[PDB]
Amino acid sequence: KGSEQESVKEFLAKAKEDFLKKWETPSQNTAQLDQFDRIKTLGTGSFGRVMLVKHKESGNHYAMKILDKQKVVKLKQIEHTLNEKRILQAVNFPFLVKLEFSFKDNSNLYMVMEYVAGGEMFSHLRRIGRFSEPHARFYAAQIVLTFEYLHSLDLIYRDLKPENLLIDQQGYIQVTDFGFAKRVKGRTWTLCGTPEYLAPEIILSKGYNKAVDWWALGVLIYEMAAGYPPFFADQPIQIYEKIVSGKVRFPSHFSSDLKDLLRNLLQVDLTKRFGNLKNGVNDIKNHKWFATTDWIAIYQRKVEAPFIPKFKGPGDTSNFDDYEEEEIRVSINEKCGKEFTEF
Amino acid sequence: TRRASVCAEAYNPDEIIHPKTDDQRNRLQEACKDILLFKNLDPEQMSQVLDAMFEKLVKEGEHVIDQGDDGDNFYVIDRGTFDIYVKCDGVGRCVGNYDNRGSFGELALMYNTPRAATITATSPGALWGLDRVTFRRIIVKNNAKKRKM
Ligand SMILES: Nc1ncnc2c1ncn2[C@@H]1O[C@H](COP(=O)(O)OP(=O)(O)NP(=O)(O)O)[C@@H](O)[C@H]1O
Ligand SMILES: [Mn+2]
Ligand SMILES: [Mn+2]
Description:
The complex is a heterodimer. Chain A is built from 12 helices and 10 strands.
């Protein structure tokens, strides 16, 4: 029934056509650094950080991810970085952050995305402790639809986690960080993601597909409902040992339906894992835990959000943690030009 | 705390023997039996991995690994004594002593991250090492031949 509510056949067909067209035609240098006023850092990463910025001519606020080219080359992330920008600029979905501009200079790569002021789901989850099943379900439904979309384009997201899920002003999810997103038609092999969310097949280099995203969803749902991930330890190896074992313990307050859904998503045997069976995503849309889910209302964003972050106005960064600031210096010599031409 | 992503070197297969005595191989296999990435290997992969592990001779006072450095190798002790210390906020502390047995650098087999400690040989010793890239190429090339779907 859940899967019979909305007809997505022609939608996914057209979405695929549009994606392919844009994927092959990314724009280059659609803006420049001096067209933005840097206000504050929203988050930092290995290649640099994401800053809240104001477009000087329009006055609109955006989130600009800055990636140090030399660092990207050193950490051997050239391909991933090129994929991140090429894929993000080509996708379009209600729950995916939009890339507004991109450009590069002698030192860095820049991705200017729409600013999602609500903050990371991570901060809200850690403050609230744990979400009610209905609250967790609201977010889960959005991810289910997003993966159906991404997977239909033969893309794998590969880094689902609360830290990469932003809450917008209506309380809906905006997926960011396409750092590991990749076009995959068969199987891929890069060991990447975030420790607590890695599927067994990634950890063991068995080769994997979109099923790893469904596993990650299981980890996400569990963490949202429990307040902590299913496989946790103070050291990475211990985390991985637990993941490979797959033995999961559910809090006593988890409903029978939730436990059943999670046992099927956190299935160590990818061939028995929900989202990867004959009925694909429908097995998830039709699961009892989502019985009360109105998939149409979710996609159209008409469902009332169980939680909405506080907002003062444009530029408000109160929902994000504070980070040490630093001026952006651009070298007088072009760095790693050859490797980033496509950007 | 916010969790950062991890990422290893890519190797799309779809797109190395270090002589050891039977005794050496048996002891080495027995030392990696509890290592996560080894326990999950098929018998043929194990054999190929064991062949790839190289001997690392060390002199007393020599630093096997220095904390903070990039890690690309996993090590299993064959013989010798080693010290283990970690610098925390500037304070150096000993976290124990190795006595002819043990292993370290396990995480290096998955991806590069700064070494969490410095391990120095406190006497003549010998270790068996395994490079992350060499390891990955072996497992991935072997698994790439497996049919799926
Ligand atoms: N569009 C956006 N609007 C607001 N904040 C954002 C946006 N995109 C990213 N952020 C914030 O900036 C942080 C860093 O961006 P992210 O793309 O996740 O960096 P990263 O280096 O790829 N992190 P990771 O790979 O997960 O270790 C995010 O966790 C958010 O807090
Ligand atoms: Mn991230
Ligand atoms: Mn990332």
